[PDB]
Design a protein around this nucleic acid. Sequence first.
RNA 1: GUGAAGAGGGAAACAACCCAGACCGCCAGCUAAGGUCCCAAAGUCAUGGUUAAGUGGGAAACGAUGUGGGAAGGCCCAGACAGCCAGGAUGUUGGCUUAGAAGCAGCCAUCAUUUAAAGAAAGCGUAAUAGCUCACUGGUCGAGUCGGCCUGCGCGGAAGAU
RNA 2: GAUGUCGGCUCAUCACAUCCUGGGGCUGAAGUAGGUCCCAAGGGUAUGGCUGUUCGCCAUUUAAAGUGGUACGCGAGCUGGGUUUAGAACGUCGUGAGACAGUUCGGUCCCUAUCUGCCGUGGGCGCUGGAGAACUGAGGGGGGCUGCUCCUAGUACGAGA
Lengths: 122, 209, 38, 176, 338, 136
Amino acid sequence: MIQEQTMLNVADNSGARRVMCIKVLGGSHRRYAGVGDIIKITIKEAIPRGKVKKGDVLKAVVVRTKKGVRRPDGSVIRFDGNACVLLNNNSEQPIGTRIFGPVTRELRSEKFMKIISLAPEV
Amino acid sequence: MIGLVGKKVGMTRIFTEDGVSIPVTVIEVEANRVTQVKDLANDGYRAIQVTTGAKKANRVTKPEAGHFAKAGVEAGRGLWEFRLAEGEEFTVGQSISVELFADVKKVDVTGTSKGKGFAGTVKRWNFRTQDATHGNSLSHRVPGSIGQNQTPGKVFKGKKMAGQMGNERVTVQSLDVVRVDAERNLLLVKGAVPGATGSDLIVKPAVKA
Amino acid sequence: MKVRASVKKLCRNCKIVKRDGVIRVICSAEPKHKQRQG
Amino acid sequence: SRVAKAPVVVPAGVDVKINGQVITIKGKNGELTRTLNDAVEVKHADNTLTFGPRDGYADGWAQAGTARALLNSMVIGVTEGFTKKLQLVGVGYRAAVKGNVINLSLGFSHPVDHQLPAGITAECPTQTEIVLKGADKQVIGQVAADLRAYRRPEPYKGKGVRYADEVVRTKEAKKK
Amino acid sequence: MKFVDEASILVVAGDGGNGCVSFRREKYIPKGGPDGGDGGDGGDVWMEADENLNTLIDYRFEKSFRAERGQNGASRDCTGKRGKDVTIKVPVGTRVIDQGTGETMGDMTKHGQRLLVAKGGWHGLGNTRFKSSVNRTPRQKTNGTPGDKRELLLELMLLADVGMLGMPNAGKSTFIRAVSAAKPKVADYPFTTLVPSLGVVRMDNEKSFVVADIPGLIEGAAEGAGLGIRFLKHLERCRVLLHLIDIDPIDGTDPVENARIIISELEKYSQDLATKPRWLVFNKIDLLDKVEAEEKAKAIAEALGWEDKYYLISAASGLGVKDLCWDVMTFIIENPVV
Amino acid sequence: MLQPKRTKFRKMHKGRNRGLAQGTDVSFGSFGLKAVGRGRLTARQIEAARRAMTRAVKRQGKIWIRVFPDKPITEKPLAVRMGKGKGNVEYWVALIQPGKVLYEMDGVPEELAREAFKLAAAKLPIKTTFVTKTVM
RNA sequence: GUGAAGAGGGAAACAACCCAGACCGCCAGCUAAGGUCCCAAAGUCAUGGUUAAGUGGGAAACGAUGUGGGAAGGCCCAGACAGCCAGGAUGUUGGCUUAGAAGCAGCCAUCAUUUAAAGAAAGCGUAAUAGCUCACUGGUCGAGUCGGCCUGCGCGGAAGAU
RNA sequence: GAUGUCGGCUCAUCACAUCCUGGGGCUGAAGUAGGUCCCAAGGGUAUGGCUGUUCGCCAUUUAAAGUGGUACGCGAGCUGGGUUUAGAACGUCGUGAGACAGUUCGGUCCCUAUCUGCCGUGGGCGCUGGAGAACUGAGGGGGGCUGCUCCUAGUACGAGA
Ligand SMILES: Nc1nc2c(ncn2[C@@H]2O[C@H](COP(=O)(O)OP(=O)(O)NP(=O)(O)O)[C@@H](O)[C@H]2O)c(=O)[nH]1
Ligand SMILES: [Mg+2]
Ligand SMILES: [Zn+2]
């Protein structure tokens, strides 16, 4: 699962390489974030020439979960490494132009088509 | 209309045409027989007493044997009373089938849950376990404080601490029925029901919307 | 509407009435004169 | 008190019977019965109605006047009838009458259905006009109030249901 | 709603918290010391620049905005919470002048700008902050500094793209009917409108422009004695200044002189409005039923001596309204400087 | 701020408010304000009432003050043990008995004086009443 | 004065409050404070009133067509008040200032005509004309009405934690 | 003649002078959203950095991160982080021993439940011949939270936003 104070990777080419999930949105007493959720992250290290810098705080969308994703037919989608897509604070729009890595089909269910469209896999 | 009384033999998933797995509970129901019918004149309320299964003759004693013989019904595992619906009428000795649940599409299951014995405060009331380090001594799963100082001077009733869990009636509401079999006498209900395998279960129509 | 201990006819069209054991003022001209706690 | 000092006179073709403290003023416009307070006495007399209190009662004439007013209302209700006038102002405000069923649409997400009493009839000569006919003033007043409570007009545009003779307040409000 | 300027608002900065003189006494220490928490910082009033807002109707009633009092310092070294900030919504283009030695603190530039108008009062220090060798049991109390009581005058500049100027005899107000639906007062008497009103002509979803109707003036309005020339101030921001000339006026009966009298006050307001590219169109064309309409409109064109492109429009219904809007928005496109 | 400029003694006993009043007859005006109950009249109340009356009467007519504090009141400061001598003087009050005349008015009509006294009664910590000048 | 150094009765309990100062015993009577619906012993006693709030049975400044009594005042059958039916202008859009001031955005005089009455005048509305009132008058209705004081008993003001 | 103090953890309860949800009045209430006042305690009422901190500032969510009482709730439930017996040091006072509601480091938290209280489970007796079953219900106990989207409807309102 994904919770606060969690070391997270990146699935986009915005410029960040490792991001820190420190807050999860959705409601009061929010404990964990699934595969499609809105979370608050802080940059821990990024390319100096990238679109983002060190210490910036912005919203992110989960793409892969280490625990897995529960399919309606009793199937779990495990992953090796948890990443996220950088999004603007005011508007839920991706910052990076490309997505590197597998993407689950659940993101389409909750109306997240920007990541799905420019994803060279599922 | 009334429900049925049955026994749980297990539970298994069901595959749909679109591939979605529906985990349902398998409950076998025997053809119940009406043993007594109550009316306003005698008991002041309308209800019917039914029995299910069979019981060995040696174990059956004279009182219940005569009670069964009065209604012309053989021995049964147990007796239960179901309240009518102000207009539905039943006669003594007629058998109760299972196909009548073909339209309710929502059932309520009541039964005796699994007995956990004497359970602790953490397991019973989902309390928070204290720290196991930082100097803590002989207090990890203890409830802790159970009241205020001498101003109340007592422990209020209904306070939450360790006790005996299970072995009690538990009601689960708004359970969807998937399939019912008449020739095999099986009922498939979506979800999980209380109790262990082989325990007696009582299924009733859903009372809520 | 205002609730205050002291109730008085602010204007000429303030009628003092006793409703359910308490003093109330009804103003047919405009509802700013409604009072309670008489 | 002083209002009860003037006896009321029932018109021709109206029969009045007394069975204790119950009064019936049935006639051309239907039949109705009203119970009294067990404290004011009405005496059978010539073609008029008189009212009097009972010795030992503090209220007496204070409620005798109320009884006189109620009888004055019911006699004209059973001889002439009671009419209530209601009109609709504003777009999207549709109303019609079908039998003893009236439907109201005041911009809601669902039609509003109201049930009329047995002795109350409603008609819609105009699409935005409803007239209530009844034999008792209290019943028609309650019906009109119930209809009005759904869409009580605001003092900004005046949209809603209203009486013909009533006046609404218009406020010139501008901010935000 | 309607565009009205000269809004006045009074705001008070939050008063600072009040310290408390308390002493600490424990189970085994009768002499603990002065233990009084300091007060909370007073509330600070703030403001925001809103692109969406274009009117000051929300401040016409001189509402008093109160910043909550800073929490008083509680005993046992409990510091009071600072007062919450008060934010007032302000449109773009407003300048603020105080009452008494008034000056412009700032001018609105872009949406989201923050400007400080009154700083909150300082917190009141408790007895814990003044203990020393000289005095070991402080009994004095320091009250928080009072907030800033200031009077603010909000003046708003017109944000419309098209400005209207003409005599009251012209159908300037009814011109809005053919181009938009704003419902101002339209009637056959002069000085029908008393305050400028706004309106938008959205012929397409992608492109639209805002046109505002301004009350007319009289021949003597340049010097005064009427509504003055103060409503000419709501100009110099519109890209084009539409002008209507009332053909064959019922009460005027002099189209030659009233057409040129418009420029008389125009050339003497402050700087002749920098000779912006104003247009010239006529109204009440439907009154003239046939060919007679246009030769006199062309005849009056030579009186002005401008000889550029002219439009024949009737404000009652259509008749050149649909295509004149296209020409008005066309001039908007090439010139993006406001 | 009504307070004697010089006093023979700085402090006064608590005293009592027994007996009846002396200044019950009007001898300076036509409309007089008379107390109904016992109480303590601080100076602050006196000048507050005087300012209220000046505001009410639109600065016309004559105003008479029939009461003066002439008595100091001592209050102990906060967090001070009992004893250690008497406290210092903070405010001066006037003790009056029921029937004492407070204020007297002249040059005003009946309704104006009545409404002024009604306004004054709010600032007065004790019940008051309206009286008029009577011969002898 | 009481307790200390006084028992007992009453104030539900309650040394210091009221009555009352115990030599002992009695299955006798009479009283003090306090009570007589019961718990718990004694009036569901008699006479004439007040209270509608459970006031009794905790509380103030102030407010109120709550109610009872008292002394008075104005208008009163040469028709008393409130309702109802009508009138309520004539020079005159008064002058000035005013796009618009016709009564009711500003100032002024505020006199003066036929009337049972009309004020260049108080309130709503119109930019202003309009259109509604008010003061006032006429007619029907017909007997108390209006507003000042004192006093008893009532209401609100009256929100804290087992 | 004695660990008994503040804070933190677990456990909560009660009042409404109500933070949200609920029902309204007025408004200088076009609408959404706002201000004030009334009724209403059924439910809910945050995560981290700093400091021991209660309280606070900061960052980010939510409907809110309510006000108080209960020996400033709760140490025969836990922690000993503050202060603090015995050690030592810094700055000040005192010639000095020593002291400092001046600061730093370190520095023993006992008890096998007798009674009432509470949680569960049993034995005797009674319910009037005995016994086996099945039920009505006098009473008591448990829960009563809501965010977002869509249709209504870009409808009413609104010049447009
Ligand atoms: N037939 C016709 N009548 C017109 C036309 N334009 C105006 N009118 C008439 O002339 C009148 C002019 O008055 P109005 O439009 O109110 O003038 P305004 O724009 O308000 N000017 P101001 O605000 O300065 O008084 C209109 O009310 C209308 O009766 C037109 O195109 N055709
Ligand atoms: Mg105009
Ligand atoms: Zn009023």
